[PDB]
Each structure stands twice: as C-alpha cells, then as structure tokens.
C-alpha cells in the first residue's frame, strides 16, 4: 500500500517495475541505460 511494502521483489528505482530475480532486474535496466 502507499504507507508500505509486503513480502520480496527486486523493484526497478527508474520505473517502479518489480521482478522475480536480480538478474532479471538488470536485464531490464539495460532498456534504461548502456554504454556507448
Ligand atoms: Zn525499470
């Protein structure tokens, strides 16, 4: 709820997208930022 969170989630801090994995997580924050 807005007053807080339950249970686990790797949550995305730039979007607010919540996965199951941090290595999901960081295939997802590839779409947000790479090097080039
Ligand atoms: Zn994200």
Do not use: P
């Amino acid at each position: 709820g807005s007053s807080g969170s339950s249970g686990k989630t790797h949550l995305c801090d730039m979007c607010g997208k919540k996965f199951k994995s941090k290595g999901t997580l960081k295939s997802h924050k590839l779409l947000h930022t790479a090097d080039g």
